[PDB]
Design an enzyme around this catalytic site. Sequence first.
Site: not given
Length: 336
Positions: A116, A313
Amino acid sequence: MDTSKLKPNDPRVKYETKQIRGKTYSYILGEPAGPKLETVVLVHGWPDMAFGWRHQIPYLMSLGFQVVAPNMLGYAGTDAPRDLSQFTLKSVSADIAELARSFVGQDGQIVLGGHDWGGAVVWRTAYYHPELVKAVFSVCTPLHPLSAEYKPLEDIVAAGHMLNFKYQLQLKGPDVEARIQGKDMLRRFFRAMFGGRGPNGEAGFSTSDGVHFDVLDKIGAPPLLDEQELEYYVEQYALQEAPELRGPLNWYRTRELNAKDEMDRAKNGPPLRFEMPALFVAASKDNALPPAMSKGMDAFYKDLTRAEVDATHWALTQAGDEVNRVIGEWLNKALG
């Protein structure tokens, strides 16, 4: 050696702090069994923390690596400065460099991994400190070129571009910081961020609009955390001074400052070029960072390895074992 994921407050690792470039940095420290091969520094993103690497830390330890996983600036036990200039990719890369060298010495090298916002950090760290970075990997986050211009994100999305990032308008604004305060709200926030859904299937978060406040009270248990992990996130985030999300949200408030640094490097500094071995792990079901986004990434690397895992994610956890294998195999080749 027990290689199963870290549990909250797991005794197999140490929980330390150091002063780093004027800030208290907290981190998880894991030691290998026997003499260390390398030191690996792992860098989480939003809204995660060092514990986000709970699958990877003991695995890498068992492979013979010393592992340093900081809570990044603004998170958990780490300081959250008032000044936004401390949150730039360049300033945080310099934090990572100093932290790294407090373990390997000024002449030493590390393996560097990110996810991220942490992925963005480690590409920049490898660019700003190639002396230090022996090998580098990112999960989910592809390389982005050095900024050649700055346009306010409002204008970019109003023109119909970067729409999968529109949630960042809400995050940088006042709303999430003001409304998500205290443990009870933090708990609901995390059930939303980690895939929880309401009685009618309503999502607590979207890449279009951000945090859906009306949904939070009704949001159910996230599939991606067990109860104890969820409570650990709440407790660690509550270490921050209220409003507790100020630090984490400051990562969305640096676009202009980052663009100023990088326009300078685009004009005057070295080109984005990674000579050291690099790995990018894409996540098939990644909403915020779809694999298509890594289009022409390969041109910037002497030695890039691509991989892909079937996960959202939250691939570090949801596909922990697979991510571990991909990293392990790449690291073996990269170092041998």
